[PDB]
């Protein structure tokens, strides 16, 4: 039973790692889109 618990805890750690990577990549790609649109914002400011 002890070895069962240890393996299960390792699995939970790995799943948390996976979800954390999901969140980091979501954040970064959204930030990149934001930077592109901020560039567009400065461009449209110049346009007006």
């Amino acid at each position: 039973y002890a070895e069962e618990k240890y393996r299960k805890n390792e699995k939970e750690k790995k799943e948390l790692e996976k979800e954390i990577r999901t969140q980091k990549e979501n954040l970064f790609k959204h930030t990149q889109e934001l930077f592109k649109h901020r560039e567009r914002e400065a461009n449209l400011y110049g346009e007006i």
Binding site: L16, L27, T31, E33
Partner: protein
């Protein structure tokens, strides 16, 4: 696991922030481009008058 989950929560909150920013910026883009179109219309109206 504890440390991992803390950082997971932080990343989720950051993503939510950034998406809300996307929405706000899109509404702002709506309004500003409306104004730009009106302004340019008036620009070429001034050209007509010139």
């Amino acid at each position: 696991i504890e440390d991992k989950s803390v950082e997971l929560e932080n990343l989720l909150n950051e993503i939510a922030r950034v998406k809300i920013d996307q929405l706000n910026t899109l509404s702002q883009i709506e309004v500003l481009e409306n104004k730009r179109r009106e302004v340019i219309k008036e620009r070429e109206e001034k050209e007509i008058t010139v």
